[PDB]
Amino acid sequence: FDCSHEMAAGILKQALAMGMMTEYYHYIFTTLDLFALDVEPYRYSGVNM
């Protein structure tokens, strides 16, 4: 995902809704502000970010 960290926070929520935050998916983020993302909703799921 090449996009701002605000876009990235938004697209992750949609990805969860879509059954795409699981061990099958690996997401590389272009943003340097990745560390700013609330990651509480996703760390238990097994996705790779």
Add this chain to the structure above:
Amino acid sequence: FDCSHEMAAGILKQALAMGMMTEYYHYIFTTLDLFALDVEPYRYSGVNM
């Protein structure tokens, strides 16, 4: 799931967290108050309830 509808609301949240609300899972509910459950978090996911 044989349990009260309040238990069922609770166990569904845990099932979501666990990557178990998807098209692979089919849940039959014993409770007659199934229709009382907030189903907004789950209807887009493809689970069968």
